[PDB]
Amino acid sequence: EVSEYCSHMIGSGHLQSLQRLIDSQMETSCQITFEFVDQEQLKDPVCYLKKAFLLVQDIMEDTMRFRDNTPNAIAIVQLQELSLRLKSCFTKDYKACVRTFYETPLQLLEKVKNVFNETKNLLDKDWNIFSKNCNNSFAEC
């Protein structure tokens, strides 16, 4: 269903909500375990984001949980609706090729923010970037 509206989709307002959510979080040394794409196996910027975008979905449901009707909770919902819209921009075929992490919640938030931010950057340059077959890229894993 991919379209020229793959850009204009990740607004700055989205990134602000993420930043505010990040800024609200208490700086603590505690680490949380989560599944995410390994930068080593995927040096390719375009195929890294492709694999990451899929994983961010599970992260926001499982990890990024907030009290109902709180500003952060609403922000998460919007980011999730955003991700549904970002679907049909990413072409995909057949898991794995990923690694377990053990980082602070703030570091997790920075990863997710980076995923959304860099995806916006690339789509501004060209909205049809993430429609490439990374099956070959997903082989070297």
Binding site: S7, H8, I10, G11, E61, E81, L82, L84
Partner: protein
Amino acid sequence: IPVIEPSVPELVVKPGATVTLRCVGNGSVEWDGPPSPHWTLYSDGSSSILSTNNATFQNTGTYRCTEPGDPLGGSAAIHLYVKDPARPWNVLAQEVVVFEDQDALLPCLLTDPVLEAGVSLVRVRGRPLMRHTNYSFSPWHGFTIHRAKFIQSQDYQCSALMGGRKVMSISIRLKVQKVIPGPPALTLVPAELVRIRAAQIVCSASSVDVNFDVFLQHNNTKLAIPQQSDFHNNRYQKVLTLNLDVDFQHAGNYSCVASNVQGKHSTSMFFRVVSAYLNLSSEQNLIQEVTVGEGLNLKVMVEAYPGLQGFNWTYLGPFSDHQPEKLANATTYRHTFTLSLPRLKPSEAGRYSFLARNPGGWRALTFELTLRYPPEVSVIWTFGTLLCAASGYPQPNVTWLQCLQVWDDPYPEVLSQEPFHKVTVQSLTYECRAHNSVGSGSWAF
């Protein structure tokens, strides 16, 4: 209401079984149900019969009988389960589309009603239902998600509890759509514009969805303007900003047009190119004649660019120079300036000048206000000849009365014709009456 035999809410059969559904009404009746093979249909006047010799899993579903031509008759229903093994679910559709706040039926038909107590709705890959998912289950129909939300647009699975293990149906994709009322909401400003040979025009459109176009076109040739895009207050914005650091070739009909899956919407404005201007006009004649005691409003229309740096009303009237203040105005490139002159006194006759000034220079419009003249009569005897005068504007007549006799004198031999005075006439007891459009006059000698 029509009657179905067997009188049972549901049936459970094996693949290969023979199923015969019979419906009876007063008038003709007809069956509706799952589009499925091997169905034979027998129908006459009052009854109708569905029947198959090789029942298959595709035959699973609700079969409803209605009597057309009976209005408000109602319907009768029966549900068929064809338990094709191992296989608790007969999914009718792997895709469902609804709008937000609608019920969303996921048509997974349970092949065995006793299983109902141990069924649930889940997502693929074992994930749990989204938070605050309101839903219920009906054996004949499947799971209904109540008041569906965009966030719930997911791939679902129906879970059946059989011998401890949960057995999944094939996936069912749910599409929940935002209710998009119409084309993108436009905001083109300013609605009016006029400059001397800077300006700014911003074309904007906003919808809850991102999938919409917006373009700003000069005349019918669209301009290539990079659009700024942002998401706020749960809405997408797309803004085309035109900056002209201007000339005659830039003037014209800028149309702001946005489209989507709904349709196309358009709004527009006009852009004019003049240097700085200042034009003064009046719907009124500059020469004014009113009767003493009457009210008058002197109105000037001012079309100016840039904004006026000063304006006033001045009495050049000969009568003592009491100056206006009186002056009111309505409408910013257009203005109307009104000098109110209620119950005019005789010292208020004369010249009133309206002046306006801006970077383009200054302009003035001068009104001449004459008050009504009533006929004024002067009769003298000269050498045997009497001589009457009568006076006013407009040009009068004269009624002589010996009071016995009358001579009348409509447009006499003229004494004074000059701009801005009384129109003087000369007529060669003798009551000499004077009448113009203004009034009555007389004198006796």
